[PDB]
Design a protein around this nucleic acid. Structure first.
Lengths: 91, 53, 88
DNA sequence: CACTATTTTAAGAAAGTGCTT
DNA sequence: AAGCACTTTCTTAAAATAGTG
């Protein structure tokens, strides 16, 4: 970008909406690339601040969510706190 | 630090002729490129590993 | 320069999977914080192992998903490829 | 909604590890 | 000794994108 931004809530509503639209497509493009390069089935569910839904799924959303709900084995699970801790550990 | 484009050019040209070098080939190639014998040996090992897709 | 086609070498596929999975979760985290949104991400790899990220409680996002009735943006691999081609 | 200066991502390069031949 | 099969540590091209017209 023309300037580095801090990862903190964008307080200007207009800038927040423009950033949301650009980065949501960028995120769905990266999900598509991971799905195809590495033979992965992915679901991505996004609610914006007004609770509108935006989704990506590699092939079929309902198939991925069914596999998710039937999965009984322990599995890797990440939250914002784990992502932040990983980024900090990279000094 | 990375090898010069000229060093990598010569290493790749030799690799397409012979995937494995004898010690005398390796030591003489190292002398011409101004690298250590180890650096040429390891460049050949890494190049073979990368050629396996 | 990167063609979006299956990486056929298992070892290279796994190295790319690990890098890009974290890269995707990092971008999801950034979008959730910058734009104040709720995101859930489910990944099954080629062996059907499950990797998940959510910016908030996963069960609350999935419940909101299942109750949502209105038409909405829904992308898949097929239509993302078509969008990228149209950027000719 | 297009452009581009700038930052961010991830593929690739030389070296590290710890075996086996 | 050197190969081998990864792994680590980086560098740097390629991709994404923040501010802009």
């Amino acid at each position: 970008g023309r300037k580095k931004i801090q990862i903190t809530r964008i307080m200007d509503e207009r800038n927040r909406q423009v950033t949301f639209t650009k980065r949501k497509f960028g995120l769905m493009k990266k999900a598509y690339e991971l799905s195809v390069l590495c033979d992965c089935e992915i679901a991505l569910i996004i609610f914006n601040s007004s609770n509108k839904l935006f989704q990506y799924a590699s092939t079929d959303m309902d198939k991925v969510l069914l596999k998710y709900t039937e999965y009984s084995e322990p599995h890797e699970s990440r939250t914002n706190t784990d992502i932040l801790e990983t980024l900090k550990r990279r000094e | 630090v990375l090898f010069s484009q000229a060093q990598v050019y010569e290493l790749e040209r030799r690799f397409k002729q012979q995937r494995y070098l004898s010690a005398p080939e390796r030591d003489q190639l190292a002398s011409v490129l101004k690298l250590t014998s180890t650096q040429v040996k390891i460049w050949f090992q890494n190049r073979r590993y990368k050629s396996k897709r």
